[PDB]
Amino acid sequence: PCSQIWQHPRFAAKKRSSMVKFHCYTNHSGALTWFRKRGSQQPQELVSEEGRIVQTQNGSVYTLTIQNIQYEDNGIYFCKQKCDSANHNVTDSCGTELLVLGFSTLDQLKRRNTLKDGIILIQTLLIILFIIVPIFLLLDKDDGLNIDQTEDIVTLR
Amino acid sequence: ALRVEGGPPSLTVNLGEEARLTCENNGRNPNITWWFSLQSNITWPPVPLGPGQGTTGQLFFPEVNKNHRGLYWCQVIENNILKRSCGTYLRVRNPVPRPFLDMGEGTKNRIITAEGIILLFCAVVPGTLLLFRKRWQNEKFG
Amino acid sequence: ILTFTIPPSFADIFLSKSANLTCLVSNLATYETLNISWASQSGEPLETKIKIMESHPNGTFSAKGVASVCVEDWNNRKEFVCTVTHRDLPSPQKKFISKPNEVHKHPPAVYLLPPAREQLNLRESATVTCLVKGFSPADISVQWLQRGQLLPQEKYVTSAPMPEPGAPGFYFTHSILTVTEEEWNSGETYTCVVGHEALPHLVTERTVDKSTEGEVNAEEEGFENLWTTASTFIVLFLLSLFYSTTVTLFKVK
Amino acid sequence: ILTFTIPPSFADIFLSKSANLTCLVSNLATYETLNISWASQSGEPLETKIKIMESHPNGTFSAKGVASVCVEDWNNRKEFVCTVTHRDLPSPQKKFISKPNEVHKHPPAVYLLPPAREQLNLRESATVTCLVKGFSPADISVQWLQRGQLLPQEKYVTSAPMPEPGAPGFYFTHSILTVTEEEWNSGETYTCVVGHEALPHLVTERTVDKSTEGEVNAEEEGFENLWTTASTFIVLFLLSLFYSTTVTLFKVK
């Protein structure tokens, strides 16, 4: 009855604040509601804003355009329709799974990860050092030498 | 008189790793087809693939390649009734193979902040120990 | 009189899903007795399209015979015979066209190069070029799209495939999409599609735009946590330096 | 007997500071009665030099007419006609010639283009491409240099000149230097030069070499410098912590 909705490039790998044109090609005429999905959360209504969401109706086609796209806009986009055909047969589109790309030149990511690995190894070493410092210092402060008087393996322990 | 689940709108897979598609439908055992295409309006008709395997109609690419990016929509025929799916999208990304350093940006940067806080505190406390020691040894000498 | 048989191009083969054979006859003094008939090795009758090209400056004519056959027959290296009985030819001429023998296959490796900064500095125009390298069959069709709309062949050129240096049997080609600076300045997404036989799907597509850093990485870095660590570390540096100075002064007193 | 007129070439004009007008006539049965001389449109006779080559294997002789006149008149598009008469010619073959149609004559605009990072990702080979576009004359000679030495044609390949869209009568060409992966690591000097008639210095060359020429972009590296200064500050903080630890240990010890 009302299941002839069309869509456009779905994956749409884009950089932050880029431009693509959406539409809602259909073979019917009725009430329309844009919806946005992120992750597994429930469908939610979209709110129009000038220069951020452009809504021009080309007759049976409902053009859409999203500027200033950020990471919060990652998810699935589609346009609903209302089919008041005495049976509440409510149909929907299929989807447009937008993605936001990390610009790490696909190469600096390796350098950053290697650096953080260095720093948390430095954590291991320094934290061991600063946990052995207080006890070995209060032993001298309170007043090691006794153990030596009482071999290399014991010293390591 | 019938519907079909659209499946994932997009899909990701590592290069050289198997990618399996899907076509879920309410039919009993009804005719299924794979019609590969491209993103937008090109000058070529959709390229039909093989017939799939199993009752579901699942594709299989044992060694996928970079050339396999594009839509993969499944065609279902059920007693002279036609219905079009939506279409997936294969793609390769070659992710990061280095899991040693506690995978998760938030994880590593959070433990970095914890590094700063704990290192500063565990350096400050030795200062208190040192001043206490100095006072006690000065008392000892006197 | 030299006669040749020409297989159809890949573009028409994929467009019509029906190959068109060619029976090219040249150096014809007369055309009233010209008759091009197409058939297979088994002798099955087939319709033949007859068309005459413009006369050459030397006075010689030309003609070609077009027969519609399925592409699967060409894939099965099926043989076809074109029979020509001309008054200038002492005897009828029998020839056969079929698929060439087995040859190494290699799908093309598409690469789309964005215009150089120096080229943009003259603010005149931009030539977007996508390099297609490493395909054994020379039958490759390269097109370009603007916002998903087909671009006429008068707006771009595609060099005929030339053998790949350092690797015999492989061919490479270029395609230059000369675009006005105003059109490229609007952040347009420009793509070239490569239809080619050796491709696993027979067609691919590559994209490039103003971004030029269109690496696919989903979301890994750039979170506000990086700013959080930077600020908390600035504070950490300040406190560490102050602590060290106070330690030195408490050593003093 | 066919009479052909050969316009003078610029090479000897650059070297010998003079232009040679050649009236090459072939298919000559006999030469003992031949009378070939140079002339002008206004009937002014010219000094004609007769030079005859050896017999052609087809049984026909040949002759030439050589004249030397100032280049400036030839640059002024003066119509010079070569008079050819023979005993076998019912009428003389007077070929009328002048400067061929001069055109906009624009010099090439070379825009060296770097390899695509996707191609480098294969770790196998890279192609350096230098697009040469915007020249009127068909002739053009692209050569690549390695560390100041000419690169032989055995390693690189270049595309033949083709008309460029958007401007009739305007030509362009291309080129590609395949390089191996370890060649691209070493940061060698990849430069391609262009020889052209319209070049005011007669030679031009672009330089995109080593392993990276740089690229300015939008935002993009801001968090990168933030990360670099964060790493520097973690380094300083580590140094201060180590200094404090060593001071404490030495005061204790």
Ligand SMILES: *[C@@H]1O[C@H](CO)[C@@H](O)[C@H](O)[C@H]1NC(C)=O
């Ligand atoms: C709408 O459906 C009718 C009937 O099938 C068809 O003729 C027409 O082309 C369709 N319009 C669109 C935009 O698909």
Ligand SMILES: *[C@@H]1O[C@H](CO)[C@@H](O)[C@H](O)[C@H]1NC(C)=O
């Ligand atoms: C619909 O889109 C076309 C193509 O962009 C445009 O020419 C036309 O004016 C649009 N409809 C309007 C604005 O009435």
Ligand SMILES: *[C@@H]1O[C@H](CO)[C@@H](O)[C@H](O)[C@H]1NC(C)=O
């Ligand atoms: C929508 O239409 C289908 C097909 O007639 C029917 O099976 C389904 O129950 C309908 N849904 C609603 C909400 O009416």
Ligand SMILES: *[C@@H]1O[C@H](CO)[C@@H](O)[C@H](O)[C@H]1NC(C)=O
């Ligand atoms: C459709 O059903 C017929 C039933 O015999 C079968 O032969 C055919 O292969 C089916 N379509 C497919 C699987 O392409």
Ligand SMILES: *[C@@H]1O[C@H](CO)[C@@H](O)[C@H](O)[C@H]1NC(C)=O
């Ligand atoms: C899609 O591409 C075809 C082939 O180039 C073209 O005929 C058609 O007009 C394009 N889109 C539309 C508006 O139908």
